[PDB]
Enzyme design. Sequence first.
Site, PDB file in Angstrom:
ATOM      1  N   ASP A  29     -28.818   4.341   6.076  1.00 27.59           N
ATOM      2  CA  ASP A  29     -29.312   5.365   6.660  1.00 27.59           C
ATOM      3  C   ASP A  29     -30.392   5.172   7.789  1.00 27.59           C
ATOM      4  O   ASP A  29     -31.442   4.459   7.417  1.00 27.59           O
ATOM      5  CB  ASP A  29     -30.031   6.038   5.435  1.00 27.59           C
ATOM      6  CG  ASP A  29     -30.195   7.801   5.715  1.00 27.59           C
ATOM      7  OD1 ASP A  29     -29.689   8.622   4.770  1.00 27.59           O
ATOM      8  OD2 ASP A  29     -30.828   8.206   6.660  1.00 27.59           O
ATOM      9  N   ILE A  30     -30.342   6.092   8.656  1.00 26.82           N
ATOM     10  CA  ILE A  30     -31.145   6.043   9.934  1.00 26.82           C
ATOM     11  C   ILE A  30     -32.622   6.704   9.565  1.00 26.82           C
ATOM     12  O   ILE A  30     -33.551   6.180  10.271  1.00 26.82           O
ATOM     13  CB  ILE A  30     -30.718   6.581  11.016  1.00 26.82           C
ATOM     14  CG1 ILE A  30     -31.268   6.204  12.345  1.00 26.82           C
ATOM     15  CG2 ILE A  30     -30.562   8.216  11.046  1.00 26.82           C
ATOM     16  CD1 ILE A  30     -30.746   6.546  13.800  1.00 26.82           C
ATOM     17  N   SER A  93     -27.179  17.182   4.972  1.00 26.76           N
ATOM     18  CA  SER A  93     -27.719  17.115   6.330  1.00 26.76           C
ATOM     19  C   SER A  93     -26.482  16.907   7.173  1.00 26.76           C
ATOM     20  O   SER A  93     -26.671  17.355   8.408  1.00 26.76           O
ATOM     21  CB  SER A  93     -28.740  15.944   6.314  1.00 26.76           C
ATOM     22  OG  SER A  93     -27.768  14.999   6.189  1.00 26.76           O
ATOM     23  N   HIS A  98     -20.955  12.233   1.676  1.00 29.85           N
ATOM     24  CA  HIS A  98     -21.616  10.965   1.646  1.00 29.85           C
ATOM     25  C   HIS A  98     -22.354  10.835   0.512  1.00 29.85           C
ATOM     26  O   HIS A  98     -22.957  11.713  -0.127  1.00 29.85           O
ATOM     27  CB  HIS A  98     -22.569  10.761   2.982  1.00 29.85           C
ATOM     28  CG  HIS A  98     -23.538  12.066   3.221  1.00 29.85           C
ATOM     29  ND1 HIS A  98     -23.234  13.163   3.570  1.00 29.85           N
ATOM     30  CD2 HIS A  98     -24.858  12.131   3.034  1.00 29.85           C
ATOM     31  CE1 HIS A  98     -24.235  13.988   3.944  1.00 29.85           C
ATOM     32  NE2 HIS A  98     -25.229  13.143   3.498  1.00 29.85           N
ATOM     33  N   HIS A 100     -25.513   8.770  -0.872  1.00 30.57           N
ATOM     34  CA  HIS A 100     -26.802   8.215  -0.761  1.00 30.57           C
ATOM     35  C   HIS A 100     -26.980   7.250  -2.095  1.00 30.57           C
ATOM     36  O   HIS A 100     -26.705   7.536  -3.041  1.00 30.57           O
ATOM     37  CB  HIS A 100     -27.924   8.986  -0.833  1.00 30.57           C
ATOM     38  CG  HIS A 100     -28.160   9.991   0.220  1.00 30.57           C
ATOM     39  ND1 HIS A 100     -28.640  10.089   1.554  1.00 30.57           N
ATOM     40  CD2 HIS A 100     -27.512  11.359   0.313  1.00 30.57           C
ATOM     41  CE1 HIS A 100     -28.531  10.935   2.291  1.00 30.57           C
ATOM     42  NE2 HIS A 100     -27.815  11.931   1.533  1.00 30.57           N
TER      43      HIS A 100
END
Lengths: 112, 115
Positions: A29-30, A93, A98, A100
């Site tokens: 994750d960025i 987001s 997705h 996490h």
Amino acid sequence: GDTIFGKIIRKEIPAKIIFEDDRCLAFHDISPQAPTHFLVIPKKHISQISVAEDDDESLLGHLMIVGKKCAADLGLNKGYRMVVNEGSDGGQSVYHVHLHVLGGRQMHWPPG
Amino acid sequence: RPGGDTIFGKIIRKEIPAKIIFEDDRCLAFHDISPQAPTHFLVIPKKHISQISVAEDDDESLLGHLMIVGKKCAADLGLNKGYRMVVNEGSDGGQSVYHVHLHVLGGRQMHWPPG
């Protein structure tokens, strides 16, 4: 509608890729929220978990199996937390499903 | 005794009461007794798997089924603004019962980070 995760899948923008197969991609994750924080995403464009189909069951489970294998490979032997956000209340987001995976620190309760 | 003797195995066999939302041959959805959101429930497999880190490759369909059931139950419960799904693994994950369980939380704004 395309998303930034589509661009990442297509290799149009960079990401720190952990694992890839024919049907999913795992990458860091960025905006990490823990010392290890990565995503596992399907290559199929499911916008949100609320619209996933019954035929997607094994694919969704595949995200979790890939997630747990990546977590072990990344040394998360004390545990981790897996999260799927849906919609505005869920804090989703990007409108591409997705998973996490967060670890490397104590995760707290409530989970947000 | 199939499902094991964790509290969740007992709940599966109707030996301890629970507020059940949905039940099929593969899983059970029921409300959390210490809710962290206005709606907070769990989806668990009937097959005993202690934790996600030991799930087998052939468990993929079952794990995905937990999420599909979770999202269907969330819709049935009117969580039209969304929700968060959580699996805790081990000590750092905050896991307290060693029978796999997917949390579904909604009815309020969830915050980031997720713990």
